[PDB]
């Protein structure tokens, strides 16, 4: 299914625009999107193994991919956690399923967000990448209201060949990211 809006949006719009604001020399130097990642701190689903499957399957739909698991290693004595047992949710996506997700993002999720204002332009890792947090997961389309047993939060990230956050801000804004200016 190699075809979509954001797809060509990067090629026939952002690609040349990046050659304007800074100008490059090689097509392999222009900041390219290539890795989106999700995550869910599930110290909650520690007790119930059932609540873990729920978050992963709800995740499987919104990510349009296959969920994964990643337990802890240390030992949060303070919060009933220790060595190798609990859980942490994560799912990496790229290529096509990456673009399709970014579509639901700035076109379905972000819009109907609780009094959405934008995306904090400080959330940059300093380098050419970005990380954002999100509460309600039901903000995603296919997610039904009479189904979410809990408003399990989660935060996502996204990698890019960029090396300066200025290129990141420019790139992302051109990508359709509504930054809270």
């Amino acid at each position: 299914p190699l075809d979509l809006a954001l797809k060509r949006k990067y090629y026939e719009e952002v690609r040349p625009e990046l050659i304007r604001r800074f100008g490059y020399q090689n097509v392999w130097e222009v900041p390219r999107l290539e890795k989106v990642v999700i995550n869910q701190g599930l110290g909650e689903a520690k007790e119930d193994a059932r609540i873990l499957e729920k978050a992963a399957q709800e995740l499987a739909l919104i990510t349009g991919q296959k969920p994964a698991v990643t337990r802890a290693k240390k030992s949060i004595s303070n919060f009933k956690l220790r060595k190798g047992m609990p859980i942490g949710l994560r799912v990496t996506l790229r290529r096509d399923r990456m673009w399709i997700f970014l579509e639901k993002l700035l076109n379905v999720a972000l819009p109907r967000i609780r009094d959405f204002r934008g995306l904090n332009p400080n959330s940059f890792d300093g380098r050419g990448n970005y990380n954002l947090g999100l509460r309600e997961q039901l903000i995603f389309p296919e997610i039904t209201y009479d189904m979410v047993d809990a408003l399990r939060g989660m935060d996502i990230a996204v990698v890019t060949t960029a090396e300066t956050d200025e290129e990141a801000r420019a790139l992302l804004e051109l990508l359709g990211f509504p930054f809270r200016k």
């Binding site: 299914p1 349009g64 579509e103 076109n107 379905v108 819009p111 389309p141």
Partner: peptide, 30 residues
């Protein structure tokens, strides 16, 4: 499958996701 977001304000986008009949609202169109 082409998920057609039918947000009730004047926007029907053909993305990709489970079930094309995606009933939404208050999308980027408004």
């Amino acid at each position: 499958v082409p998920a057609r977001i039918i947000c009730g304000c004047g926007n029907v986008i053909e993305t990709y996701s489970t079930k094309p009949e995606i009933y939404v609202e208050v999308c980027s169109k408004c």
